[PDB]
Amino acid sequence: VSSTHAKVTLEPLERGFGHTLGNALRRILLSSMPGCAVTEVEIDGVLHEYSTKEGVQEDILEILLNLKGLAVRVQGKDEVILTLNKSGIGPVTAADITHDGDVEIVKPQHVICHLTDENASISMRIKVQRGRGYVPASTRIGRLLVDACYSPVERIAYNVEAARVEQRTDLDKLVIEMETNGTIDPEEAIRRAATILAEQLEAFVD
Amino acid sequence: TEFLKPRLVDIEQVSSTHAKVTLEPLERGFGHTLGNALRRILLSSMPGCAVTEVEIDGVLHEYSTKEGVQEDILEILLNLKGLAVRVQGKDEVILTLNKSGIGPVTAADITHDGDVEIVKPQHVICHLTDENASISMRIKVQRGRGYVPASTRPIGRLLVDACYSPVERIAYNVEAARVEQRTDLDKLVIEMETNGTIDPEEAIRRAATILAEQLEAFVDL
Amino acid sequence: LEARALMMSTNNILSPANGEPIIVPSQDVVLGLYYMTRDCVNAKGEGMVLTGPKEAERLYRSGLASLHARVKVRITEYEKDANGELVAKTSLKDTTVGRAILWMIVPKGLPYSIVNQALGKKAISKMLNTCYRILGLKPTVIFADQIMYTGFAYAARSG
Amino acid sequence: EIKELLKLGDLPTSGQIRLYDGRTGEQFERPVTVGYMYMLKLNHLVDDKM
RNA sequence: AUCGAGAGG
DNA sequence: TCTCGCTGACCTCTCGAT
Ligand SMILES: [N]C1=NC(=O)[N-]2=C([N]1)N([C]1O[C]([C]OP([O])(=O)OP([O])(=O)OP([O])([O])=O)[C]([O])[C]1[O])[C]=[C]2
């Protein structure tokens, strides 16, 4: 389908194991996958989220939402700071961030803001932290706390359909609806989730 | 971002059948995943021993009665289906029951075998009413998993539906655990009810091994 | 050949007595759609801005946000042009988590206002009729199958 | 009287209990009434009719 | 086959 | 105009007696 959307199917699974394997993998991908994403941002123009800047097409909520949409990879830093200063006429693009060695952007063409008047401009610094899963900004509690999506998965879904092998009719087939943000290959994300789940129960394997 | 590994910290035996298993060092969100996966695997794929065939000398078919026995042959077959045994030697074994005189016929009356261990010799199979009557049956016990009906693949042998799985009930609860100064960790407490055939720790090991064997397919490309 | 071309259940979308669709979600599916699209005051996850329906689904599955939470989501919708081409429109709309999740099965070419309400039987009937009028036969049958699946699933989840 | 009998058995008086989905382990969002109803099998078996 | 008595949808 | 015959009022299963 895409470099971020993939399909994997396991047909010969025993009865009742589809809702075990798929559910476990879905939970691990949703809540346990490690990753780094934007969690904080400070804007000179706007002191608070409620306050609205002048000279930029997108409101503060849209800016925070685009920051949430940003997918970033950090090499060896737990918390890193990325700064963006933009001037002229045109949309504010993720490629405008000053390049850093430890920080990489999978999709440079990610719009954060749209510039309306050349008189106004924004200089913004974003904080990126490595974590696991999705923690809302409300639970985290002029610093703008934005939601952080550490887990690379964008959507995970599984569906169990009966598949019949010769002489056996109760066997189950599992198909995976897997969507990623482009940080890692969705197949490799499935591999990571399976590895994590296997390593969790290593203390019980005979 | 290293993940903690759960450990078997306590296996409590409330009774011969009722047991509680605790898994203390679990991360947040892993308790429910492990509990559900282990509960499903324990309720589905635990092997056990159940009665498959019963041969009575004076009985030709299930829908008959034997003189001196208060219970019908069908009821005797149901009572033999409700029999829990353990075999260490091989899967297939033959048990012979013989008793005479007035009095209930219990699971202790089966002839003693070194391999076969009857966990509950108290429950009755049939009753003998008058002294002259006698009962003589050959019981076949096999090892398997799940429910295999007698309909799915001589005169005088009585096929019995095999409820192989020894697990009766599974309940799991996730509670907070205090490891070092961390409070985000939680513990998984698995509650088991069985027929006495399987060891709860062995049940946990078997379930985890099945889960890992299934997961290795996803681990590989 | 005549069975396939005339008597197939896929060719029987509309009633012969009147142009209303004859296949319609009912019972469990209607209850599921009505549970998804209904809203509640002070539900868990209220007031959070979402980047799309997929984030709403993620918060629902994670247990972070309720299905009736009144949130603000970015929805991209398509409307047919004069020549019939599809042009997208992106905006932030006041909706709920359930409606955002439901929007994923709605085919391209329909307004978001169809799902931005508590969906009864009449609402789903009108939505199916609109889908048939705008898109055609095969999109209508695919949409009906998806609606039935979603309604069954979320009626089961509703308890 | 039904509520009192439920009380004596250490059961909720509303007649509804919290159920968990077997396939996922996720609690159902609303309480579900659970009890014992006398079910009958009618002489309308499918094998006699197929 | 037909009739009578039921039953289900 | 009003009596006065003549007309009309889906599918499936089980049983026994002629
Ligand atoms: N031609 C003709 N003559 C009849 O005398 N009957 C017919 N058909 N049916 C058929 O069977 C449906 C109702 O049966 P029922 O028992 O399901 O009642 P119901 O209200 O629909 O549901 P429920 O029983 O759950 O209350 C009905 O449409 C029809 O096709 C039943 C009687």
Q: How many angstroms separate the CA of C75 from the C1' of F9?
A: 61
CA of C16 to C1' of F7 (A): 34
Contact B79, B69 (CB under 8 A): no
Domain boundary among A150, A171, A197: A150
User: Do residue A40 and residue A72 come from a single domain?
Assistant: yes
CB contact under 8 A, A134 and C64: yes
Packed helices A186-200 and B30-45: angle between N→C axes, nearest 10 degrees: 80
Resolution of the model in angstroms? 3.1
A23 touches chain B (CB under 8 A): yes
Question: Rounded to an integer, what is the distance from CA B209 to the centroid of its chain?
Answer: 19
CB B187 within 8 A of CB B175: yes
Q: Which positions ≥6 away from C149 have C-beta within 8 Å?
A: none
Protein CA at C24 to nucleotide C1' at E8, angstroms? 28
Q: Ramachandran region of residue C78, left (φ > 0), alpha (ψ -120 to 50) or beta?
A: beta
Which residues touch A163 (CB under 8 Å, ≥6 apart)? A11, A12, A171, A172, A173
What are the backbone dihedrals phi and psi of residue B178, each rounded to the nearest 5 degrees, phi first? -110, 100
The DSSP secondary structure of C49-97, one letter per residue, reads EESSHHHHHHHHHHTSS-TT-EEEEEEEEEEE-TTS-EEEEEEEEEEEH
Whether residue B94 is found in the same domain as residue B25:
no
**Helices marked H in chain A — which ranges?**
18-31, 60-69, 137-140, 186-200
Closest CA relative to residue B142, chosen from B174, B95, B100: B95
- D24 touching chain A per CB within 8 A: yes
Q: Do A41 and A116 belong together in one domain? A: yes
- Are residues B129 and B190 located together in one domain of the fold? no
Which of these, A34, A31, A36, lies nearest to A126 by C-alpha position? A36
- Asked if B187 and B178 count as a contact pair (C-beta separation under 8 A), the reply is no
Range of the structural domain that residue B141 is part of: 48-164
Q: Count structural domains, chain A.
A: 2
The reply to whether A15 touches chain D by the CB within 8 Å rule is no
A101 shares a domain with A39: yes
Token couple for B158? 């009585």
Residues C129 and B106: their CA atoms lie apart, in Å, by: 69
- Whether residues B139 and B82 share a domain: the answer is yes
Q: Give dist(CA A150, CA A39) in Å, integer.
A: 9
Distance, angstroms, CA C16 to C1' F8? 30
* CA-based nearest residue in chain D for residue C68: D29
Q: Residues A50, A130: one domain? A: yes
Q: What subunits touch chain D, counting only 3 or more CB pairs under 8 A?
A: A, B, C
Contacts of D26 in chain C (CB under 8 A): 157
* Distance of residue C122 Cα from the nearest chain D Cα, in angstroms: 25
**β-strand C70-80 against C49-50: which pairing, if any?**
parallel
Q: Are residues B9 and B22 in the same domain?
A: yes
Instruction: Tell me which of A150, A180, A196 is where a domain ends.
Output: A150
B90 and B170, same domain (yes or no): no
Contacts with D, B 108-167, CB within 8 Å: none
Cα radius of gyration rounded to whole Å, chain D:
17
Provide the CB-side half-sphere exposure for D38 (13 A, CA): 0
The last residue of one of the domains, among B164, B184, B212, is B164
Q: What is the CATH number of the domain that holds A163?
A: 3.30.1360.10
Q: What angle do CA B33, B39, B43 make, to 5 degrees?
A: 150
| One domain, residues A142 and A96 | yes
* H or E element in which residue C158 lies: helix C137-158
Under a CB-based contact definition with an 8 Å cutoff, are residues A120 and A55 in contact? yes
CA atoms within 13 A on the CB side of B9: 14
Cβ(C153)–Cβ(C49) under 8 Å?
Answer: no
Nearest C-alpha neighbor of A14 from the set A160, A146, A116: A160
The verdict on A88 and A139 lying in the same domain is: yes
Is D25 near chain A, with CB under 8 Å?
Answer: yes
Residues A63 and A134 in one domain: yes
Is A198 close to B216, i.e. CB distance below 8 A?
yes
Chain D CB within 8 Å of residue A195 CB: no
Q: How far apart are CA A206 and CA B208, in angstroms?
A: 8
